[PDB]
Design a protein around this nucleic acid. Sequence first.
RNA 1: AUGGUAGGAUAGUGGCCUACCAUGGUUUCAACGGGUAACGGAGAGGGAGCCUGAGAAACGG
RNA 2: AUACAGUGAAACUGCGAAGCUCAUUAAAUCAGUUAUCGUUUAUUUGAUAGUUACAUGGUAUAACUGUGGUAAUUCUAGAGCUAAUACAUGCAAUCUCGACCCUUUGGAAGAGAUGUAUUUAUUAG
Lengths: 602, 234, 171, 43, 137
Amino acid sequence: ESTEEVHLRKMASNLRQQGLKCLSSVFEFVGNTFDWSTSMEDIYAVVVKPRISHFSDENLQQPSSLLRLFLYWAHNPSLYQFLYYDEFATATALMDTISNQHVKEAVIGPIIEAADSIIRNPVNDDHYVDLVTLICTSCLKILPSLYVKLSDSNSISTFLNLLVSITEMGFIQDDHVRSRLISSLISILKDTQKILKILKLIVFNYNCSWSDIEELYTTISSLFKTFDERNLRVSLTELFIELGRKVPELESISKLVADLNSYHEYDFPRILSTFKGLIEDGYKSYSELEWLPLLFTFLHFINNKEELALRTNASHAIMKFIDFINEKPNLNEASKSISMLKDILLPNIRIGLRDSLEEVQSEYVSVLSYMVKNTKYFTDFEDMAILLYNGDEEADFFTNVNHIQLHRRQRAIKRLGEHAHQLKDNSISHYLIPMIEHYVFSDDERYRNIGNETQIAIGGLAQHMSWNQYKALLRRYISMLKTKPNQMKQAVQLIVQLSVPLRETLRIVRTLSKFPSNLDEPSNFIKQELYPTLSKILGTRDDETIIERMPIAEALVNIVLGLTNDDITNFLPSILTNICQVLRSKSEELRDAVRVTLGKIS
Amino acid sequence: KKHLKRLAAPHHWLLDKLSGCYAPRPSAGPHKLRESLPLIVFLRNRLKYALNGREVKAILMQRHVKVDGKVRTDTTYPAGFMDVITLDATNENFRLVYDVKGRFAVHRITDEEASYKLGKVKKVQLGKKGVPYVVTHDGRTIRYPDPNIKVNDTVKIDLASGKITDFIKFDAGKLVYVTGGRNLGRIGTIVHKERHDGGFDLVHIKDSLDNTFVTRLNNVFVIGEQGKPYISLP
Amino acid sequence: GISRDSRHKRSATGAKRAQFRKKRKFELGRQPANTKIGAKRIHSVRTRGGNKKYRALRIETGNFSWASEGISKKTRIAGVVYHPSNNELVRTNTLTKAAIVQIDATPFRQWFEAHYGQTLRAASAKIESSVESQFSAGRLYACISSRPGQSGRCDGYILEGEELAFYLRRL
Amino acid sequence: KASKGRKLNYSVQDPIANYEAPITSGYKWSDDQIDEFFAGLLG
Amino acid sequence: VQSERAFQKQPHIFNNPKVKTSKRTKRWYKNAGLGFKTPKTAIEGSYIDKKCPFTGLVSIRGKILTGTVVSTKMHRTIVIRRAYLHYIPKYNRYEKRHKNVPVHVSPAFRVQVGDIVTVGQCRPISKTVRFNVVKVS
RNA sequence: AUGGUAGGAUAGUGGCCUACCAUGGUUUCAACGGGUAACGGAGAGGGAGCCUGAGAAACGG
RNA sequence: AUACAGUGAAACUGCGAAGCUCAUUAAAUCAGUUAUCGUUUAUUUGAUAGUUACAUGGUAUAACUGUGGUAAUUCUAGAGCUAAUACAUGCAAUCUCGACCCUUUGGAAGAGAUGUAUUUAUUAG
């Protein structure tokens, strides 16, 4: 038909659309029951053949009736003769949809499942062998691109199902097939057991060179600390054992890592012996690449809490690495070690310092102490060493803060607060405040005297602190006021303790580290965030916590005065009247609370 | 019932109590009876253009009166708050705003001011076929509203097209008109909204003289920002 | 004669109240439409306003829903088996909402065959054993969720799971 | 239990008193005949 | 739970026997607002109560009152007592009075005789019950 | 009669009524009952019943 | 006015028909106020429905013509007409994903998608 017969063309298109659905619908319902052997050629020649040439570009967006027909042919072994016809044109057409750049995930998922089904469904004919080879080669070459396009977790899984099907089928026998499957896998890394099993089969059956697997080794080394469940660990150790076999250099490390991680329960005599081995010059022998899985395992044991021997040895095991940095002749090879110290240990120390468990924190506190004491090549902790006064005891604050005697803890935290000015801002925000803040929110009777002095210490520390970190410290505590009911009193007092360091920053500028030169920018931050948020909390009508929110008003009268005098006149009336609106309250005890707070404000 | 005594008529109409036996009943329309000014009262007793109901009928029948840009021929049509009345023959445009005493005042406005009105958002909800719309204080259903518009906000409606030109959120520091209670007709800035869930929400308002008063939220109408009203005030 | 006024009742403190006035039709109440199995008979009753209600005096058909497989088929009603409120309705086979009735399993049976290709893919075709027994017997238990006396319909849903077990023990 | 009439009440009800009068003639068969036939009822 | 002739269930809430994703039957619940914390026993309870403020089809609106529990003998409702000092102008003096209010109580609340209950007004539940218990103390 | 479960009906909540279940609810802080300068709600010849309409058990039939 | 066309009885449709006289009743009348997320609502007002036809039938009769009964009524039977906003029937479009990245607003292969009302069930919310 010519373009003139628009109506006739439209109806013909509808007939094709409806019929193609009709073929898919009937063939889905009675696909297996009826025998098509007579109609295989007639169906293929008149329907599939006219549309094979373009089939790639039409069916990119979402599955279509003609495409759904091909998928069922792929799924069902008896119907593979459709795929066999004409040098695998239809199978090639399916691959061409995959090869297209603009192919969307909705059509990949059905195809990739269909390709997996063919691999899993052996058929005894010559055409099948040619078919699977074409499907595998086209799939493997292009797998890493498809994964990136995928946006569904199930779509990830069906991909990995095809990869394991490849390993079981034995196309990984070939070197080129093995390389492509590795390239796809590293894309997935760049469900989990199925990955590890796929890695185990590809790695165990075949030797790999060290350069090929070095990147895999580092990531899989990191997977030790991330992994926690036993099934994750045993599979992970099995890979490392095989990572050892192929490359003789890693055989020693994988042997170590295996004896580091023993299962269901860990072999205490052997692991302790390994710890004696590394501490007594074994730490000297280990190479930079050997340290990694040893370290990641060590960070796991120190995180443990049930077995005293493991965390103690693990903490000293970390201490051996610091000595290993010292043993390095100069900075260059030390820098490569230092890079790992900054990348791996330091982030996990800081989160460790925020860990709730006391015995777990004390180990990390011990870890930081040794780093500050020995600073031959690592100079970021120089400020802490100044606080330490050469690591002198009762002067270090590291032994006192976790001392058995509580009075020694309390006497030490005041000293730290006094000497906050000598300390560098980043350390004050990243290490120190995390180690002490838990005393403020501690619930036990014994630590309240420590908590009160901690609030004073944090206030002084925040005074000698950076503007960016100090903001985040404030915003976190305001979130705690809304989010945490039980910690409101601890939060509000600490916010008042954080108001004042911002205060002593703002008068002389009209102190805090890296304070902005222009007073307008800090002023605005207060006007739209601090004054409104704290004010609305103060104005809330919940008599159960009315006493707890009174120190907010002190914080309000703080944050306003260093703002410009015009801003001062703007906000004090709203703050002070709210103090009066609680002053009018009938309760005598509450009124006394207003009177003292109004006094301190005054 | 269907008849209204003058003694029982609303106080705010200003109507003298002894003129006759009976007063006009506002017909059904955009505004409530107790919060509306029928065109007969407006045109005869405030404007003095007509001398009895019959000249009022003649005037309305001449189609010289437009309420919100459309001709009205009903003698007792219920014109109300923020309603624009246009008389093209006289080249006059009026907006109905309460005075401090609480009565409608016949406030003359310019053509641009007549072109638009303000409606307090009574309700925000989606109709059939998933089409959002807003119901204002005058019963106008406006579809496809701006998402930020919520209840208690005010929308500037263009009379010719009946579409929202702009909107004001209900927040502290906004300029506000009292549309009920003893403080009826007063203007002031919001200070605080006292929320009593399951009960009548109360708003504190401070005038330019710094005097403060409390009024129910249902009597609140945002008219602009402090010092920048969107309407010419009386 | 039927009225909905609360004036005729006794007070909270309990004085026997005296008749204020004659009965008004805006607390009007109407007779119970005792729906029963058989050839459809529905009457149209004019209510307050322009609204209308349908009075299914007789009905033998109903649109019953298989919630688990998410369908709804029109089926013949066999009879009332159990009604939680009063057993006389069961004895008189009066049709009301919450009444446990017996319905046609033929269309559901055919539908199941069509969609799963299996007499009564396999895991999906699996269903509760008790309902399988009900189909083998040929009679299906269902609960009426529509009101025949207001809408004129006897729609319902097939009993399953905990509800089916509870009613089976009650039976 | 007594409420709603679930229990039988044996008190007088005035409207129903003397609604009908008994027929003095009685059953067509004599009382002795009726007594005899019941004694032999169903053997 | 199933102690009645009919089967007790939350209307329009479905548990699919086939899917059997979770052992627990799906439970619908709501917060009544007014800063009244919905109790955890209601969230994970097994009771069915059409008049419960958190799980039933009843909404708390209007007056909120407080009272002292005086009777808890009947099923799922109680009788509370509220007292006040009424002013007599002729003598200019106050006299004590009290009134008894029947209030629905959900099974999620455990109430004895003597405790203080805050109650919320709702639609007419029964001949005399217009309120619903929303907080116990 | 007080309340719960389920049902019937309303324009809808609700013992308003119906089937089962518990024996409850107000009251000496005045329930209940009595008197009254509490003019300081009923019907269209008399009861019963039906019909219209948005709204009447209609001063209509 | 060669279909009628101004006015217009009758009839069919549409809308609306919603003072007196007796008794008496203590916050159960009434007044103020709250809620309807527990409801119906003519009318007014603002929005709102793309899913034989150059126009179908009497499945229709009044008014009207004419024949009669009865002491007789807003009592009446037979026969013959003729209409609707009365009674019934009823009928080659649009919007997306969009390869080709052809031209870079843009066209565009192919894939698709498309009332409302009642009742039940189910999913999202």
